[PDB]
Subunit: 161 residues, 6 copies
Amino acid sequence: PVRIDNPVGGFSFALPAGWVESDAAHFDYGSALLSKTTGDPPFPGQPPPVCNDTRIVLGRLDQKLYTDSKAAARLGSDMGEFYMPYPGTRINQETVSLDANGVSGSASYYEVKFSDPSKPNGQIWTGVIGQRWFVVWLGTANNPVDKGAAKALAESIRPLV
Amino acid sequence: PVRIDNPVGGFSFALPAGWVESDAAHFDYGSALLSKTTGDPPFPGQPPPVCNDTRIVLGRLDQKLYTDSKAAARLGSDMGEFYMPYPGTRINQETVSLDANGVSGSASYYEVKFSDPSKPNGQIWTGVIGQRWFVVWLGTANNPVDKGAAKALAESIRPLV
Amino acid sequence: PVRIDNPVGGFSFALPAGWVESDAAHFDYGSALLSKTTGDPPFPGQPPPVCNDTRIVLGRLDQKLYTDSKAAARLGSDMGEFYMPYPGTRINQETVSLDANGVSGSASYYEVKFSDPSKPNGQIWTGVIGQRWFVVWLGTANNPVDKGAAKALAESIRPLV
Amino acid sequence: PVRIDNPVGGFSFALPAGWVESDAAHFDYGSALLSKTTGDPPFPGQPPPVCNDTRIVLGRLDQKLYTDSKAAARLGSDMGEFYMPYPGTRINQETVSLDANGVSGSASYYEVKFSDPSKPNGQIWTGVIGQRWFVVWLGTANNPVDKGAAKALAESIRPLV
Amino acid sequence: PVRIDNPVGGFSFALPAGWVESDAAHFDYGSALLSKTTGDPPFPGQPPPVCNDTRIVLGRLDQKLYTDSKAAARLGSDMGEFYMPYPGTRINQETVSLDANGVSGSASYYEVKFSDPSKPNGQIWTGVIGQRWFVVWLGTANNPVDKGAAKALAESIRPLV
Amino acid sequence: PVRIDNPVGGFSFALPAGWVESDAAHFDYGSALLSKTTGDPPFPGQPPPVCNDTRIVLGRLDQKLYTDSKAAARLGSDMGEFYMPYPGTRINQETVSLDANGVSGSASYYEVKFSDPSKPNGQIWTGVIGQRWFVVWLGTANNPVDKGAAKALAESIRPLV
Ligand SMILES: [Hg+2]
Ligand SMILES: [Hg+2]
Ligand SMILES: [Hg+2]
Ligand SMILES: [Hg+2]
Ligand SMILES: [Hg+2]
Ligand SMILES: [Hg+2]
């Protein structure tokens, strides 16, 4: 169990097994971007290969932006445009209640069946917890969102004091 | 009149007056990203301040991706999701014929009236010319797309030989 | 109240409200560079717009370099050349005693009236606390140094053990 | 046919089909690093996915460093240590004469059978042409060096005047 | 005594006196790269000049990769190819037992006498401790590995919990 | 003789022998930053070691900013504050007439004797040619400005058409 502090964003979280940070700059402004290692280890000290069709973003959710249920739905809709900007239809929608050590939240999940029959279906899970924090886990039919792990990641969020 | 070569993307173009390149890395894979200087000059040798609500992207349009009229409409719809991922309504739509030294193309323009009444309206102009190249010019009601300059930029595109 | 550790520089500090880290690399060698958000929030996970006419630098002050009163005056004079390299006259000078949880220091403030009548006046506040640490807060007549917040930032410095 | 100038390194070359530049910084000091696109196109304007098990480096070969036949063999031996630092045996060695528009050179190729039976065999082709320039094309049994294309790349090198 | 946490790699370590972090990105995936300051201090807030012929890398050693004695020897052999890819002979070999607060490990050291008589001899110290962590300290005859400090660095490693 | 184009800044120039570009980003906005190699060659394809006490900046000189004689003196005074922000006295001043293929300009040179007796004297040469372009060559008593080469660099500037 690996806990990561994000002091600018005011929270800590548990790093999902098999994931690394994608860059350092997100932490400058209170966010975090994570990538999934492929499992093939790099030479020691060098950066590991990571998947290009899945990613996780988390951070403080600005008080100016966006109930946690309504917020996660709205954020999830916007995130899906930003990360999956191709025409398609939303299918297999779900909402999930969150409880991060007693701090309530909500998440919205859905899949995108793209108009392009050669594109794998997109998948997106967006959680809001709470001061408020968000978690977005993006994947595809070939590299699916791990819904149980996304819930565990959001429920691992703790405010820093 | 400043002409810029993009050898990986197979084209050259005229840099719009008052704009600079935003980074060098786009040219690595045959694209270009431009930013608009604010007019307040920096110390010599240092990077100029640029606007944060307008941008231009141009590059080779992959033969796998997307008539030029249909292509610019589809690309413009996707670009507007990617750059303006908030809910809203498309208004003030236009299409524009392009002629780049005899190479035909088409562009699609529209504005977005956002659901959020405090967001300025978004503006996007997307052109496809042609091997094919694209031009996307993004702005807002406070920093509008210069439609005549966007047409001139797309019509300035020349294949490199 | 957000406390940030800088382990290479041997100190922690309280992040001023409304400010973010400008990059990650400063911490590699025991410094920190901060930028002021404009208040217009970015899309979640993306970097916020920041002001281009104000900045804060802090870090360990090398034992080889530069009383804390004399040190802050000398450092402030050099910092003003580095950040405001245009001809002008220093006006509205002040010195300020510092007490960081019992660790004494001193700061030097002044404004620059530039020879160029179209340049807004520059403002710089430079503090030395203490092992020694420095704080430099730069602004202009349009985006002034918050002198009370600069004193609070310097007095928030704690050695790490 | 896409020709790329490298003014600091004093040469131009033909970009192999399906390859892009990996970064811009190599050109600062007269080299070039190329990566192979996977074929899955990115969103327009965004960087394409590239293979992680093949790469090409080319540049001016310092007059202080390293006949072209002896030079390519020595450089190839060193490059194979640098890029394939695991124990193994060199097999399937070849040397290839080069003629770049009348400028002679030589290349050395070999494969590495690694001690680790789960590692795919490494492949490396190293050419020296000539002022002198080098070309290194690295691959594996799963993503082999295209020997004909590596020879064409080295023979495409032209001095800039 | 300066202790640095590496949460992705699951460890903390004591920063050797006179060394700084070379970049921030290594920590993204659980490694750290350190550079040695030259002693000439930079302007405050700016990065210090560092030596170009010595470096330290440390990180988690993948369970898939590589007894600690055998592991450090094998890793040291591979690291010496990666960092010193020129022909030469290994001389002055040593192995060193490690004890990091009761966690055992081993290190392998050797020097390289290069075929090129104008190259200074290379030096490399590679330690494995332990979950397992590695430490590599690289130097030359002109800027030698500090063997006592490398042992202290490896023995300063503590798992994070 | 190596000529480099800077299309955003509207000029080309001859690269001084032994110098490389320091980064790619300066060209994005019409400037160039050059560093001096130490002569010790790197491994092929890797960046060469460069001096840390000398540098060259060149670029378009904004029509809003700053006769060429008065301009070079004023720019040289400001550049010396920016690059040598320590107290001292200007000595050994010179001005130099420039003629870049018939385009006139002027340069201002001076040395700085620092108050700190352990700092080597600073040296700065600043030229303005002309649309106008600037050249700044910075050095020290240990790594002096090559005045003849700085004049040749400024006189090598040609407008791009
Ligand atoms: Hg994957
Ligand atoms: Hg603007
Ligand atoms: Hg501002
Ligand atoms: Hg591949
Ligand atoms: Hg050194
Ligand atoms: Hg030097």
